[PDB]
Amino acid sequence: NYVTPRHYLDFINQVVLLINEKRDQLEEEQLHLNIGLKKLRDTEAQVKD
Amino acid sequence: SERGRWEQQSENFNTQMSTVVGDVVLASAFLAYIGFFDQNFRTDLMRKW
Amino acid sequence: KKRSDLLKIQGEFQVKLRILEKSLLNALSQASGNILDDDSVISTLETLKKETTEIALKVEETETVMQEISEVSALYNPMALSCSRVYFAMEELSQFH
C-alpha cells in the first residue's frame, strides 16, 4: 500500500467537511434546545408567579 | 418534568459538541486510511490515534 | 424479530417527540396570559408525560432482551467457531493446485 501527499490532502478536506457537517447538525439542534428551555423556564416563572 | 428532560438533552448535546473535533478526526482517518488493512491493523491504528 | 422491530421502531421515541416537542413550544407561545386553563398546554404536556414514558420503561426491558440476545448468542458460539475453523481448513487444501 502507498500513502501519498495527495492522501494527506483528501484527509484534511474530509476533516474540514465532516467537522462542518457535524457541528451544523449539533448547533441547529442546540438552538432548538434553547428556543425551548427559555419558553419553559419562562412559563415556569410565570406560573410560579 | 418536561423542562428537566430538555436539560438532559441539552447537556448531552454539549457533550457531543465538546467531543466533535476529535470524533471527526478519528472518523476521517478511518475513512481516509483504514480501508486497505485488516481488523488488526485497523484496530491498532485506531488506538494510536 | 424483536431486537429489530423494537429498536428499529425508534421513530415513535424519535419523531413522535422530535416534532411533538415543537407542538408544546407552540401552545406556550399562543399563551403568556391565561396559562392555568390552557387546554393545549395542559394537553401537549400531559400528552408527553405519557408518550414519553413509553421509551424509558420499555427500554428497561430492551436491556433485558439484549440479555436474551447475549445468552443465546453465546449458546451458538462454539458451533459458529467450528464453522470458521472448518472453512479455513478447506482453504489450506489450496496448497495443492
UniProtKB/Swiss-Prot annotation, chain B:
It is found in: Cytoplasm, Cytoskeleton. It comes from the Eukaryota. Dynein heavy chains probably consist of an N-terminal stem (which binds cargo and interacts with other dynein components), and the head or motor domain. The motor contains six tandemly-linked AAA domains in the head, which form a ring. A stalk-like structure (formed by two of the coiled coil domains) protrudes between AAA 4 and AAA 5 and terminates in a microtubule-binding site. A seventh domain may also contribute to this ring; it is not clear whether the N-terminus or the C-terminus forms this extra domain. Belongs to the dynein heavy chain family. Consists of at least two heavy chains and a number of intermediate and light chains. Cytoplasmic dynein acts as a motor for the intracellular retrograde motility of vesicles and organelles along microtubules. Dynein has ATPase activity; the force-producing power stroke is thought to occur on release of ADP. This is Dynein heavy chain, cytoplasmic. It comes from Dictyostelium discoideum (Social amoeba). The chain holds residues 3569 to 3617 of 4730 of the full protein.
